[PDB]
Every structure is written in structure tokens, then in C-alpha cells.
Symmetry: C2
Subunit: 301 residues, 2 copies
Amino acid sequence: SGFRKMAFPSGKVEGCMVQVTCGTTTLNGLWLDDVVYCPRHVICTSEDMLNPNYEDLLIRKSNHNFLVQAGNVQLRVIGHSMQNCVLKLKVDTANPKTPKYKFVRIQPGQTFSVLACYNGSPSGVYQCAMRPNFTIKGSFLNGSCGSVGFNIDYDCVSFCYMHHMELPTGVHAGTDLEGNFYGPFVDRQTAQAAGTDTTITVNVLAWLYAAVIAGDRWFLNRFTTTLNDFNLVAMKYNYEPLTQDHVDILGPLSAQTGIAVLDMCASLKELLQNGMNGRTILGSALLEDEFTPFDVVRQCS
Amino acid sequence: SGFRKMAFPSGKVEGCMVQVTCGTTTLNGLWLDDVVYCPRHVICTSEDMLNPNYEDLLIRKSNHNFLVQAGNVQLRVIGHSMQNCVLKLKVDTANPKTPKYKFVRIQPGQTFSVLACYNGSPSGVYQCAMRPNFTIKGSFLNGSCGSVGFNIDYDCVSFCYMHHMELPTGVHAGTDLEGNFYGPFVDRQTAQAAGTDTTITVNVLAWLYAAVIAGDRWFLNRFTTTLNDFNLVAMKYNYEPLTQDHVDILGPLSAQTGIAVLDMCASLKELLQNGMNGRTILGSALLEDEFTPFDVVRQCS
Ligand SMILES: [Cl-]
Ligand code: NA
Ligand code: NA
């Protein structure tokens, strides 16, 4: 019935985005209940950027140093604290649009939607994956620090990501909403780059199952490999190794298609060792790895 | 700096989505002010599939035949009319979440966001384009009819598409919000299929300009072409011809980068004969045609 990279509807998050200014720096904050969450580096001036002491930088800050704007309304900051790399600003008014939400930390290879904002205003929404090297291959420009990534489960918004910085290659790095970085990154203007990335193998298989449910099936073969034998091949092509937990996760698509996982791995192993022979799968010259099994489950039933 | 495919934030449209039921058929409606818009084929039965006489069928319908549900609230229908292929149900309650909006009819090559919905509930958002053959390559499962396409470039939601039906190849056809189909399609189950699709050349060129802005250089060359020689090559690959209007529109991008339009056309001619050869343009081994010159200029600046 058609297949596309889909983001979650962003309305529940749009009602939470506000503008946070400290000094001359302006970025995005997330207004939930009576706290605004944003990257702590909003308190840095030009001199601190090299190696900032965030402990002493925030002691010196006062509540009135933070301008928080929700549209025309200025929210009064009545407290401030720091949780790892995230700044928490207590305001005097709970957000009446606060959705049902929780903070979650995701694993590499999991997907979520980003609501890209600038100066507090939602600009766009896109679906992405946490790469195995803990970067995000989205692109929002400079002013998008504090934009957030999220999933929606039933009616609950799960916030999993906050944008802090762009890396030299144009990929982005950030934290969960408790301020813990994804990846070996620090929120200082120092020498940082993304490690070598790998392909999220479990998502490629999920997407191969999607191509099979779409009737695109030229790649299916009669053969079956072993998990050990497949990982030796995949690890040589900078593919993430495939675990017994990954196999079980794919189970539903296995029983639905009649393609056992290690049967489908024999297909993927030849695509690795042969290339796609000038063909496409689901209209791609390359193998898509930002569809999880659950993304493939939902978008077909 | 990798230009990703972003949708518009969908919250303003989410607040307009309702569920419309006639008999056993449920689909989505668009609730703006005191009117709900939906595909008129909602009034068809299983006998009415091939050759429904919509004016005969609508006359026989009473306001009480229409069940409209906004969440846990039923909206009473107090009138109904037809405008082309779009049913308009007057309701006794104006939608308090009605945004600033307009209805526009778009041209092939134009992009927009789709809020894919099921039983009146928003499910996902994605970005797409009106194909030259007047179809959409989307993801519409059973009951996705009445989902809408929109842009929100400034403050105003411009509604440009309502989904009516899926064609044999799985692409989608629909109308503008005044009920006029895009392309030669009709809301009957008589045999119909999409014509051969072509690539939106002006959008490919905009995307190459965005790659250069992003710092790609590898596909540039020292050649130019004439507009006529380029169109002879382009059509041999089922690319759309480039008009002088297209050359004018690319003018801004030509001047930001210092690369003449017909200079860039020579690069595209070369990419068609050689392929990517392993390389990627803005993280893609396919030439992307669903990013317009306007989209590029926006997500730059
Ligand atoms: Cl247009
Ligand atoms: Na096989
Ligand atoms: Na050239």
C-alpha cells in the first residue's frame, strides 16, 4: 500500500517548544510541567567555550539571566539547576499543553522523530536513527540546539534525545533528557569527530522483510547461513554484528513471510558480497538501515 | 551538512482530523470552521463501486446518515453538499483548533507534507511530491482516504491534497481541497492506471545545488551545455524537460554558488551516463527529485 520514512505526528511536542536566551546565545528549550529543559552550554560565553567550568558558570548565573519566551509570553524563571549536560529552569507556570510523557534513553540503531526548531519555533520534523557511532544523520542548522527527538507510544510521548552540537562532518550529537551524552562527546569547543559508522544490520533485514511484503523479492534465495558465518561476513563489511536477540526481534516478520531470519541473512550476505547487480530494492540503490523491525511491523498492518 | 527530507510540523493539521462514517465505511475528514471535508466516495456502497451516480446518491442521504466523531465527541451534521469530488458536511460546532489556512492547487513537481491518518487518528507524517504523472508515492493503508497534504511556509496552512484512492501500482491519487482530481483519475473503481513516471529535473538540479552548498564538489565539471542539448539528453533518461521558467527559478541557487544553471546541467548530463560510482551526493546514491528550488532556498539562508 506504499512505504515511506514516516515521522510521528509532532503536535504534542510543538506545544512544548520555547525559546531560551542567556547572554547573546539563543536556543530551544522543552517546556514540560513547570520546568524548561535545554542544553547547559547556553550559559557559556566566548572565553569559556574552550574548556568551560560549568559548575562555576552556573553558580554565577541568576534566575533573571535566563530569558524564556513562549511566543509572546515571557515565562519567569524561579530556579535553575543542572542535570549532567542539561539545564533545568524552573518557571512559575506549568505548561498547559504538557502531554503525557516520559524520559527514555535509546540504544544505537533505534529510531525516533526529531522536531527541528529554531529560536523556539518548530520548523520541521524528520525520522532518523541513533547511529552505531552515536551520531544522528539529520541536518538542522546552527540554531537548532535544544531540538528534541521522541517516539509516541499509545498517547505517551517518549523523549529520547536533545540536540547539543554539530560535528565537523555535519552530523549531530546530543544527550538524553537526563543530560547523558550519547557517544564519546563533550559539550566543549574542542577536537571532536564521529567515529567510523557501521550499518545497522537488524534494520536492513527488517527493510528486506518490508521489500518481501511489498512483493519486491528478486533477492530471496534458497540458502540459509549460520549466525557465526554471517557475522564474520558482516563484520568485514562494517555491518553491525547480529545477535540472538536481534533474531528473536525479527521473529514476527519471519513467521509472516515464511522467510526465516538466517534464510534472509543468506540473501543479505550475497547482497554484501555481490552488490545488487544494478537493481534496486524498494527503489533504493543502497540498503536502508533506519527502519526498525517495529517500524516495519507498524507501517504494514 | 546533510539536507534531510523534512516534513512540516503536523500539529496544526492534527487538530483538524476527524472520523467520518457512512454505513459501514469509515474514513478521515478535515474539520475547518463548521465544515468537514472528506472524499465523496464515502457515500458509496458495494453496488456503487464502478459507476456511482454521486448526485443521485447524495440526494438520498440524510444528515443523520453521517456519523462524524472528533475524539470521544460526536459532531451533528446539519447540512451536506458536494463540490466536485469532495463532500462537505456542515456541522453545528466550529472547530476551535482551526488554523489560518487556505486551499491551493499545486503543479507537478511541487512538494508537500502528508499527515497519514486512520479512523480519524493521525498516525505519521511524511514529505512527498506531486509526480509528473499526477500521482503520489506515499504510504496509505486501508482506511487512509481523506488524509491531507499541506505546506506551512509562514503562518498559514496551505492545504493542497486530499487522498482518495490507491492505483494498481500502489501509488496514490486524490484531489485538491475543492474536489478536483490531480491528473485524469476519477473516483470510480473502473480500470485506471498511472502513466509512466518521469524524474523532476528542476528538483534534481536544485538538489545538486544544495549538495554544493553543503560542500560536495566531486560531480562538478568544466562543461556547459545549451538548454536544447540538455533536454535531448534528459528525455533519453525519462527526465522532464527543463523550461526557461525552470532556468529562471534556479537563478538564486546559481548565484549563491557561482555556478551557471547550464553549467550545473552539464554535471547532471555526466551523472546520468556514469552513475554515482560508489560515491554519494548528500548521503544518497540515488539522484533525489523531491526537493524543490524553494525547499533548498528555505533550508539554507
Ligand atoms: Cl505549485
Ligand atoms: Na535464503
Ligand atoms: Na559543468
